[PDB]
């Protein structure tokens, strides 16, 4: 379930501001609901595929804290 979720946040909400992101989940998530396949309420991309010593090499380039440049 969190690698469908992953591949579609990946390749479908790299262009969408923070409330539409957020309909787009709440969609996706009813979807999943309905068709009835496993995922976890409280995942994150984050911490499945941005490790901790790549996070701080990009925080000392210059990125910033949010999660949307996250």
Do not use: P, Q
């Not at 946040?9 to 969408?16: C, D, I, M, Q």
């Not at 409330?19 to 009835?36: N, P, Q, S, Y």
């Amino acid at each position: 379930g969190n690698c469908i979720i992953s591949s579609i946040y990946e390749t479908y909400f790299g262009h969408l501001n923070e409330r539409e992101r957020g309909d787009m989940l709440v969609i996706l998530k009813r979807l999943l609901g309905k068709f009835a396949v496993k995922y976890d309420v409280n995942y994150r991309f984050i911490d499945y595929l941005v490790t901790l010593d790549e996070k701080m090499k990009w925080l000392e380039c210059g990125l910033d804290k949010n999660d949307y440049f996250l």
